[PDB]
Enzyme design. Structure first.
Site, PDB file in Angstrom:
ATOM      1  N   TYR A  56      35.756  40.466  13.298  1.00 15.24           N
ATOM      2  CA  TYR A  56      36.953  40.937  12.607  1.00 15.24           C
ATOM      3  C   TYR A  56      37.184  42.415  12.903  1.00 15.24           C
ATOM      4  O   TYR A  56      38.298  42.835  13.250  1.00 15.24           O
ATOM      5  CB  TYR A  56      36.783  40.690  11.106  1.00 15.24           C
ATOM      6  CG  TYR A  56      37.993  41.048  10.290  1.00 15.24           C
ATOM      7  CD1 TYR A  56      39.125  40.246  10.296  1.00 15.24           C
ATOM      8  CD2 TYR A  56      38.017  42.206   9.515  1.00 15.24           C
ATOM      9  CE1 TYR A  56      40.265  40.573   9.545  1.00 15.24           C
ATOM     10  CE2 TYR A  56      39.159  42.546   8.773  1.00 15.24           C
ATOM     11  CZ  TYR A  56      40.255  41.713   8.794  1.00 15.24           C
ATOM     12  OH  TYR A  56      41.399  42.016   8.068  1.00 15.24           O
TER      13      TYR A  56
HETATM   14  N1  LIG Z   1      43.984  40.528   2.494  1.00 10.97           N
HETATM   15  C1  LIG Z   1      43.202  41.579   2.687  1.00 10.97           C
HETATM   16  O1  LIG Z   1      42.335  41.918   1.879  1.00 10.97           O
HETATM   17  C2  LIG Z   1      43.338  42.329   3.981  1.00 10.97           C
HETATM   18  C3  LIG Z   1      42.617  43.498   4.199  1.00 10.97           C
HETATM   19  C4  LIG Z   1      42.752  44.179   5.395  1.00 10.97           C
HETATM   20  C5  LIG Z   1      43.590  43.686   6.362  1.00 10.97           C
HETATM   21  N2  LIG Z   1      44.277  42.550   6.136  1.00 10.97           N
HETATM   22  C6  LIG Z   1      45.150  41.915   7.208  1.00 10.97           C
HETATM   23  O2  LIG Z   1      46.432  41.725   6.680  1.00 10.97           O
HETATM   24  C7  LIG Z   1      47.021  40.537   7.258  1.00 10.97           C
HETATM   25  C8  LIG Z   1      47.502  39.629   6.158  1.00 10.97           C
HETATM   26  O3  LIG Z   1      46.364  39.248   5.362  1.00 10.97           O
HETATM   27  P1  LIG Z   1      46.552  38.299   4.095  1.00 10.97           P
HETATM   28  O4  LIG Z   1      45.589  38.696   3.042  1.00 10.97           O
HETATM   29  O5  LIG Z   1      47.998  38.238   3.769  1.00 10.97           O
HETATM   30  O6  LIG Z   1      46.085  36.893   4.699  1.00 10.97           O
HETATM   31  P2  LIG Z   1      46.410  35.376   4.332  1.00 10.97           P
HETATM   32  O7  LIG Z   1      45.238  34.521   4.646  1.00 10.97           O
HETATM   33  O8  LIG Z   1      46.821  35.275   2.843  1.00 10.97           O
HETATM   34  O9  LIG Z   1      47.705  35.062   5.249  1.00 10.97           O
HETATM   35  C9  LIG Z   1      47.616  35.077   6.690  1.00 10.97           C
HETATM   36  C10 LIG Z   1      48.689  34.160   7.218  1.00 10.97           C
HETATM   37  O10 LIG Z   1      48.629  34.117   8.660  1.00 10.97           O
HETATM   38  C11 LIG Z   1      48.847  32.797   9.084  1.00 10.97           C
HETATM   39  N3  LIG Z   1      48.229  32.630  10.398  1.00 10.97           N
HETATM   40  C12 LIG Z   1      46.889  32.581  10.685  1.00 10.97           C
HETATM   41  N4  LIG Z   1      46.622  32.373  11.952  1.00 10.97           N
HETATM   42  C13 LIG Z   1      47.874  32.280  12.542  1.00 10.97           C
HETATM   43  C14 LIG Z   1      48.283  32.013  13.862  1.00 10.97           C
HETATM   44  N5  LIG Z   1      47.442  31.792  14.873  1.00 10.97           N
HETATM   45  N6  LIG Z   1      49.612  31.940  14.107  1.00 10.97           N
HETATM   46  C15 LIG Z   1      50.463  32.130  13.094  1.00 10.97           C
HETATM   47  N7  LIG Z   1      50.195  32.390  11.811  1.00 10.97           N
HETATM   48  C16 LIG Z   1      48.875  32.443  11.596  1.00 10.97           C
HETATM   49  C17 LIG Z   1      48.240  31.924   7.992  1.00 10.97           C
HETATM   50  O11 LIG Z   1      48.833  30.633   7.977  1.00 10.97           O
HETATM   51  C18 LIG Z   1      48.603  32.711   6.728  1.00 10.97           C
HETATM   52  O12 LIG Z   1      49.833  32.292   6.148  1.00 10.97           O
HETATM   53  C19 LIG Z   1      45.961  39.939   8.185  1.00 10.97           C
HETATM   54  O13 LIG Z   1      46.195  40.344   9.528  1.00 10.97           O
HETATM   55  C20 LIG Z   1      44.662  40.537   7.646  1.00 10.97           C
HETATM   56  O14 LIG Z   1      43.663  40.626   8.653  1.00 10.97           O
HETATM   57  C21 LIG Z   1      44.186  41.879   4.974  1.00 10.97           C
END
Ligand SMILES: NC(=O)c1ccc[n+]([C@@H]2O[C@H](COP(=O)([O-])OP(=O)(O)OC[C@H]3O[C@@H](n4cnc5c(N)ncnc54)[C@H](O)[C@@H]3O)[C@@H](O)[C@H]2O)c1
Ligand SMILES: NC(=O)c1ccc[n+]([C@@H]2O[C@H](COP(=O)([O-])OP(=O)(O)OC[C@H]3O[C@@H](n4cnc5c(N)ncnc54)[C@H](O)[C@@H]3O)[C@@H](O)[C@H]2O)c1
Lengths: 251, 251, 251, 251
Positions: free
Chosen positions: A158
């Site tokens: 990650y």
């Molecule tokens: N949530 C956190 O705590 C956090 C922290 C740091 C960074 N981030 C980053 O923020 C972003 C959003 O995170 P989140 O918490 O909303 O995640 P989440 O799991 O709630 O949502 C991610 C979405 O991406 C979609 N997805 C996954 N793989 C995909 C693909 N190959 N093609 C198209 N869609 C795809 C999933 O269906 C999902 O709807 C991510 O990139 C994550 O790495 C999140």
């Protein structure tokens, strides 16, 4: 007392828009006057999110696996047919790949995290940049992570993927610096979304302990900064990284 | 198509507000509904700026040398008497100290740059933070420079002072992270203001050559981001650095 | 199994040489074939340290307050009379200034930390660089701190001073990059230079909790890297920062 | 006047060992008392390099594609059969992938650069770390690039891969921080591993214009720092990045 971001007349593509941060970005973008193309892998959840968000403005949902060039090409086509432009691209759709040491993680999972989190945003940018050049305007916002700045233990895949996404952001922003398309990344700390289900509780506790603000990031707070970077007010910042770590990050 | 930053009901202190970036911040703050206390060393120029800016909203001009604790204390008193609060502090009032190698600059000029650019913002923060604690709210935005990230040759004093200001920002933000007062810095590249008169032409050319966007920063563009950081929308970013270098900075 | 650093025939000035890291650097430099000029404030501790270190090689004890130009000039003259050159300069004279929030520290202590930790190394570099230019060779190593990268809460003066020292290092290295004088900084974590109070075990546990290696830095370990940066094998690194934080720093 | 690095009795694996920086590291490691396992793709170049290097010490040539788990497993086994341990791992097998904008590079070349430059070092670390854990000692040095810090335009894949390698280094160092296995990265500038085309002097001038030292890095200079990080004197630095950019990098 929220700022009124002016996205009137603009079209915003949000990958990962069905849930979490991407969904909060969609809400704020619609409330800012944008038309939103909601791109996501999860076709069923995407349908529910589309019908919820349609109450706020114009929305077009697009099922797309952003690791597959052919599906991204079809998604660009469907978005242009609905709305005629792609002014703003928010790359939000990452996975965690679970937790484990570098040498104990499965190589197929390591590769999958790199594919979804680094190759995917690359492929989406490759498909969208020519449209922004055609328009003479764009904003790209890549959602990275504080893990990409810091290298979290038990999250090497990650962290490497999000560090790589920051590097891509820096290269692409400099390639487009004279072309009226600005490209930046954000580094959130943990936000309580469904992505927590893919991680061990001890890793969640570790992430929280490192936050001076002593709470998790809220998706709506993330959307405020993400869409600032997607607006015309973002005017002299490109290839840059904007922090959302609650005081944690030291650069 | 500018964003409407909501500063309604808030009081913004701007040091260096008579000219340049500080003046552009004042204009945008007044257009955002804030009352502005304009702090500056230059009493004559400050009077002209006050009468120009009064056309946009409520303004109180305060003559103050921000290297002198007693003058800062009087400035806080005058600001509170006019407006009753200090919700937002923008530390903008730096000097360059001219250009020369580290070993050829005069030590008194080296010390003066550290005093104005690092000690000064420290003294202003020391005086204002207790008022923000009394309010249960504040935003502090320290205007640093890309030189503070990079260490420009022939500008060792300026670079060290702005690097030190970034370090102060990181400490102070973490000290206040649970107290509802967020503290961040910005790193502009060169903007064509009167500060150019204090530098050699070859240094100005050097600064421009390093900018991928191929132009200087405009004060109004700087104000857009500075006042975002001075708004409630800035909610989960503290002790952080927000870039305004036109693609130059690599972190 | 320590590396044999080649400092044969070189003269090393070490500020803060009577104690702590500076003393460990002196021991290693003498074991590496250098002549050492030990610069420090306390004539009594200097005399004791000189007597011990003279068993390892040639040592000149120089009493000097590195915040005072006139004393630095006398110190350079005494060093050149003893040894004929200054090939390597190790700036290791820093103080902490105690702990407290930014708004509660005493301004005169805030200023004193800036003077000792930032102005002092500047003044020593401005005197020594002209000598290195006459020689056509030099190495400068500035001992900073992880606090200069991170901004520790309750240490705003210390952190700002060390961040400023890093900025100075970056400017001066670039000014000298074609002059055969390389200039770098190190960033130690908590170094075990002093046995702490028997009642502070809770605070010791807290400091160790931020260090992945789960112990404090030893002065002799710091000296291995500091003198590598003082050697000819440091050949293509300048204006750079070398970490000694036990895994803590994230840049 | 080179330092004598103590690698007596240690076994060093060098990927990309037949050419360039890897070959210079092999020469210096043999001169430092190490046994060297030279890992590379080209059996013919490997055989030539082995014959030359055997004049300096014990060398085992190992043909291996470091993107293939099964070949890495065979390579570790052959190395252990020859020498009985792997004390030091130098990952130096990177490729550039040519140059072009992010949206014009071929996706299969983008993927290939990620595979060789990021997946490969991950796969080698996952095989070697368990051996270092059995030994209770190791050092890992990942050769990254200034491009991984900066995001060079027209090198988005190379820059993202090297930024990802830095992220991996940070995670893996923290995972191993109490296990006596230290893990660090270096960031070279343009290294003179190959004499460029006689028609590219304009581009050579441009690259040199970004390097304050105004020349290219020599492989033997890189090897001095790389093997310092491979030695016991590297004792309190892990998950860190050591610069070899000739003054260019600003962090
Ligand atoms: N949530 C956190 O705590 C956090 C922290 C740091 C960074 N981030 C980053 O923020 C972003 C959003 O995170 P989140 O918490 O909303 O995640 P989440 O799991 O709630 O949502 C991610 C979405 O991406 C979609 N997805 C996954 N793989 C995909 C693909 N190959 N093609 C198209 N869609 C795809 C999933 O269906 C999902 O709807 C991510 O990139 C994550 O790495 C999140
Ligand atoms: N202008 C640029 O190109 C540029 C680039 C990077 C960073 N910055 C920073 O942005 C800030 C604003 O720069 P600018 O271009 O508007 O400068 P400016 O010279 O136009 O204005 C600075 C103002 O600060 C005031 N001031 C100076 N010393 C003071 C003191 N001791 N007490 C109170 N007021 C004092 C001056 O009277 C002046 O009105 C400065 O901190 C500068 O270092 C500017």
């Amino acid at each position: 007392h929220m700022n009124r971001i002016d996205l009137e007349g603009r079209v915003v593509v949000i990958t990962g828009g069905a849930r979490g941060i991407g969904y909060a970005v969609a809400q704020r973008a619609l409330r800012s006057g944008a038309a939103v193309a909601l791109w996501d892998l999860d076709a069923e959840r995407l349908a529910r999110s589309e019908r919820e968000l349609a109450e706020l403005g114009k929305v077009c949902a697009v099922t797309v696996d952003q690791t597959k060039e052919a599906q991204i090409e079809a998604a660009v086509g469907k978005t242009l047919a609905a709305f005629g432009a792609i002014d703003v691209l928010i790359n939000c759709a990452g996975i965690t790949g679970g937790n484990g040491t570098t040498w104990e993680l499965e190589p197929d999972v390591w590769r999958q995290v790199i594919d979804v989190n680094l190759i995917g945003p690359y492929l989406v940018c490759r498909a969208v940049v020519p449209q922004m050049l055609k328009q003479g305007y764009g904003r790209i916002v890549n959602i990275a992570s504080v893990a990409g700045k810091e290298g979290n233990p038990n999250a090497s895949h990650y962290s490497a993927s999000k560090a790589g996404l920051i590097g891509l952001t820096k290269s692409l922003g400099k390639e487009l610096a004279t072309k009226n398309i600005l490209v930046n990344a954000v580094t959130p700390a943990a936000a309580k979304t469904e992505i927590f289900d893919s991680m061990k509780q001890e890793h969640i506790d570790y992430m929280l302990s490192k936050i001076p603000m002593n709470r998790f990031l809220l998706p709506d707070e993330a959307a405020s900064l993400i869409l600032w970077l997607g607006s015309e007010d973002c005017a002299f910042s490109t290839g840059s990284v904007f922090d959302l770590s609650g005081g944690r990050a030291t650069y």
